[PDB]
Amino acid sequence: YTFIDYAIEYSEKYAPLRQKLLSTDIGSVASFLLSRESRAITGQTIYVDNGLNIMFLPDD
Amino acid sequence: YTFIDYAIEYSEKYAPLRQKLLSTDIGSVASFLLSRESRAITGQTIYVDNGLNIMFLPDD
Amino acid sequence: YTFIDYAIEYSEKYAPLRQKLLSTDIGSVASFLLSRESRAITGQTIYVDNGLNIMFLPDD
Amino acid sequence: YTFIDYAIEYSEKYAPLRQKLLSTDIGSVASFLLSRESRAITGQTIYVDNGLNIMFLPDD
Amino acid sequence: EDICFIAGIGDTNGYGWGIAKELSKRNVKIIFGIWPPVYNIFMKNYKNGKFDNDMIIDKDKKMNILDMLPFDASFDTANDIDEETKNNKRYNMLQNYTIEDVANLIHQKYGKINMLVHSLANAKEVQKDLLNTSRKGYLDALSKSSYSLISLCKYFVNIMKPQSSIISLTYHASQKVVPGYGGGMSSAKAALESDTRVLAYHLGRNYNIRINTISAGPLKSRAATAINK
Amino acid sequence: EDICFIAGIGDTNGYGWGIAKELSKRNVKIIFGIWPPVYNIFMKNYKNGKFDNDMIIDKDKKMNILDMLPFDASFDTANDIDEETKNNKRYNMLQNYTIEDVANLIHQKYGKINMLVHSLANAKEVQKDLLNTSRKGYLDALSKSSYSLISLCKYFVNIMKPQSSIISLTYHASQKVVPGYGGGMSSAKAALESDTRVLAYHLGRNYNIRINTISAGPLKSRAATAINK
Amino acid sequence: EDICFIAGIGDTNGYGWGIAKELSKRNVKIIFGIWPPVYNIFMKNYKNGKFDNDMIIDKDKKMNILDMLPFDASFDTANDIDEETKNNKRYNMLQNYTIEDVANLIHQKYGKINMLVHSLANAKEVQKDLLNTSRKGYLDALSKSSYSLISLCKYFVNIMKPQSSIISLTYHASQKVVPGYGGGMSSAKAALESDTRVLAYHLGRNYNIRINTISAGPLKSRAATAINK
Amino acid sequence: EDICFIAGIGDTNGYGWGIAKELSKRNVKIIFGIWPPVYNIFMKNYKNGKFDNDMIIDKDKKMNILDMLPFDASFDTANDIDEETKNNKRYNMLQNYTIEDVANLIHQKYGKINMLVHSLANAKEVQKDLLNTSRKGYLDALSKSSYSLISLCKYFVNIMKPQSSIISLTYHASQKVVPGYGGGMSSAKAALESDTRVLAYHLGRNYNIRINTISAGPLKSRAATAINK
Numbered sequence A, B, C, D: 001y002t003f004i005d006y007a008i009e010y011s012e013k014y015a016p017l018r019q020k021l022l023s024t025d026i027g028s029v030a031s032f033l034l035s036r037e038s039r040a041i042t043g044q045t046i047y048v049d050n051g052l053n054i055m056f057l058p059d060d
Numbered sequence E, F, G, H: 001e002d003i004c005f006i007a008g009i010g011d012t013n014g015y016g017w018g019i020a021k022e023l024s025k026r027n028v029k030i031i032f033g034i035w036p037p038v039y040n041i042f043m044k045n046y047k048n049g050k051f052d053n054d055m056i057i058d059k060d061k062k063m064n065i066l067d068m069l070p071f072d073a074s075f076d077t078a079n080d081i082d083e084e085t086k087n088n089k090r091y092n093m094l095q096n097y098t099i100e101d102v103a104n105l106i107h108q109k110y111g112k113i114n115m116l117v118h119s120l121a122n123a124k125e126v127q128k129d130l131l132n133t134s135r136k137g138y139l140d141a142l143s144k145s146s147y148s149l150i151s152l153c154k155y156f157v158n159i160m161k162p163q164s165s166i167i168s169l170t171y172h173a174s175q176k177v178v179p180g181y182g183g184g185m186s187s188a189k190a191a192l193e194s195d196t197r198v199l200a201y202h203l204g205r206n207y208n209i210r211i212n213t214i215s216a217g218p219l220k221s222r223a224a225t226a227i228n229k
Ligand SMILES: NC(=O)c1c[n+]([C@@H]2O[C@H](COP(=O)([O-])OP(=O)(O)OC[C@H]3O[C@@H](n4cnc5c(N)ncnc54)[C@H](O)[C@@H]3O)[C@@H](O)[C@H]2O)ccc1C(=O)c1ccncc1
Pocket: B004, B007, B008, E007, E008, E009, E010, E011, E013, E014, E015, E016, E017, E033, E034, E035, E036, E038, E071, E072, E073, E074, E118, E119, E120, E121, E122, E144, E168, E169, E170, E171, E215, E216, E217, E218, E219, E220, E221, E222, E223, E224
């Protein structure tokens, strides 16, 4: 089932937040970073992945 | 002239962004994170420091 | 079967290096760091965990 | 005086350890990583720079 | 219709205020948690209008402060309160200033909130570098600057609406060494940052609440000028 | 009155479209840079209303697309296109598709813009793992996925006002290993992230322009499916 | 001629022993710091030869244990000792087990050392996840697992030869969330790691002493099996 | 009885030589892979004893160089060398200098080795900063400084016994910005570091071989001086 379907299933089952990640989720963060509201942020790698990046070991 | 004044002088000199950092610069970022616009972000340490954190050694 | 047994089972399965981690594996590394051979190293967090720490999500 | 002489002077003046960094210093760490003594270390970026990498802001 | 509790304030020169001003743009109601010692004097300035100019919202609006309450992040519940403070001239006239008490207090006066802000830090020995910091000073820093966050979350999650958000303030000194920032504050900021992840996992899976921290640059407030190195 | 150029849209299923949507919510004009291999097909679909029900926005809003231009991030300037791709079935009818040309075309037609979005990647050997990736393929992944960002900046920085912002997308595989994300794409992401800092220093100091990157979760888009594992 | 003090031991199934065995290969003399509660029983096994097989050095040599001493990382000096323990059945017959006392004790019996090992961790509420950990449990973890390191350094630097080295043990849970590792241990390991940098700066510039930490993988000892999740 | 191939030596002033020295202290046979542009000159110097007082080792020891071979990490296989460099003044007299060929030559002459050292980097535009680096130059820095490591591994992994180790050198500029380290070298270092993990997974699981990288401080070597700033 290709690498990507595996990645979606695993994320939705092990990420801190359970909701399905939508393009608009990355879209609204991108909108923010592009607006003056983030005038003080730069050179950063900002994660928008329901927190999966913070985990080390799963559970089940 | 207090530890704090040195830090701000250094930041306004070697930081990627030259403008003065405002309490509202952090506030706007805080606003965004407390809203649903950032529903896919969690457990992150987000830098709002005019990018100073990306620097290794000053070019001076 | 205790938190510890799960961790070792998981490590011996998904870690880059398959061998069993020995108390002396950490000891040898400790020896080296306590010697002049590593006189240019300091303030570091050195990983001796068969590389498990470099993994994001298990391939299973 | 080229980028490198600047880097050496700054390192020797701001690094945790003051000694001059020698090729043999990186040499002995490399020898270690290559020997069985580090059989449990892998995929790592090991710093051998007298600790300069740990600093954020200088002093003088 | 969104309410935000800002814990950690004393004046309008800190980050708490800057956060409060920006949230007002989105018309969120703000509740300030003020450290007892300066609660009265703070109410004074306010009553005497010393903050009127600092309350004007960009949008040509007045910052909507729902309430100012005495709050001490070193006490989890009323039973944690010790004799010395129970006699402390500045705590006498006050009451319900422990984390659980203000959580219940807010919940009873205004219902549930959906935004939480941890904006307070304290270290008795901040002027000393790590190696010259006592066990007491070190732990006082972690209790006030770190554990307080975990505690706020534990007691405030009960009074929060679903999908509510949480944030705290930290400093890059936790990752890279900045000499002068002592008393174990660097230590505290390192734990606050690691705890933010672990709390995000639990709060995320269990309540669907998010938690994040902002590593800020320098701001000349008052708690920052007290570092003096 | 903000204008944003989005590079990396070839259908409404990727992150670009989602970004264009959210940008429209805040009413920013959008220009789509489209890759020639799928340019006409995209135009045709758009024209026959095959995207119509995808430009919808909760607030009744309907995406506002300022322009749709052919664009290939493989070429910095016109003198860069090889004769073959120059006479190729898809590129013949087209012109001004190099980074320099589109940058110029945009400025010439709408003036200076203030938002730039890099939403693309590519690698011929993504299916193969690092060890088995050839120099050719590896250099291809980096040329298309990482260098394009730098070139994109170099040319657009000049048609961008001060305080404008730039963003690109990345994936955590750059920092931790994920088997299956091959072809050197994890390597390209690691370079993009490091370059995002180097560029922030320079663009910051010299133009007062910001650049950040977003490490996204999984999305079933055309590109992603290309992995096949 | 090199002496190493290993603080944090109870049996031969921990890391302290593994470190002790390897150092013996370089013929360094070892001094063990044992937590009072198990000091006697530990001396028992030893006297009755329960560790003879665990002492054989690869090199067909016998591990050279210079001395075993009662050591409690929760007490900086004798004046820090409280009444309850001063009456604790297991502390009565003992003496000079506080950090400063054993530092002086070693220095008086064997002179200066050049190697220090911090290999101890403790959290009363390790079985609970962060959110259900009390202030007491959290701080007990930081005092025993973190501040102890800073304290060891402060008092032992006086009895160390120039260019001496120092190390401690940590766990990746401080950087990434591993559920189950609770009681604020993750918090403690995060501060221990940050403190290692700050201590390296000070100890490096001032004494030319190095300090580093080893983030280890799982080992089935005893303090690790007590976590049980 | 260990044999180590070092790639990246063109004089006794770089890190390679220092590595070869320390390896000799532990009595490991050393094979030097030498770049053609400076191959003969190196041979001549070595032959006339111009390195004689540099092969000295505290313990009276004198480096033990097993072999010195011409080697260019730009070429994976013989079918990779372009006709020009093939007929070039320096490469004509030479043969078996591609990664595949030297790997084969080594195995054919000494059998399987168990140590591999990548001590090289190069970038045509190192003097220019990222923004002003051309695609050509950028791809060159990555091809020579990063891909060579992967290709090096792919071919040598087969002439290496199990438990063998590999190492390369990197610089912190990959993680934090250092103006002046241009040409895309900071980008190449970032890729090398990320690739060091991906490779460790694969080489680990399939061959039980380790690979790590060393982030070194400043050294005034030929390469370093090339920066000129
Ligand atoms: N002021 C800065 O520049 C700065 C501020 N922060 C964080 O921002 C937050 C507050 O900002 P200020 O400190 O900027 O703002 P305030 O918002 O000026 O100060 C915070 C509050 O601590 C409160 N206090 C102490 N204990 C308690 C308690 N138990 N209960 C209730 N109140 C208590 C006190 O009443 C005060 O209002 C803290 O978490 C800080 O550590 C983080 C980083 C920086 C920083 O310190 C820095 C230093 C050097 N270079 C760059 C940046």
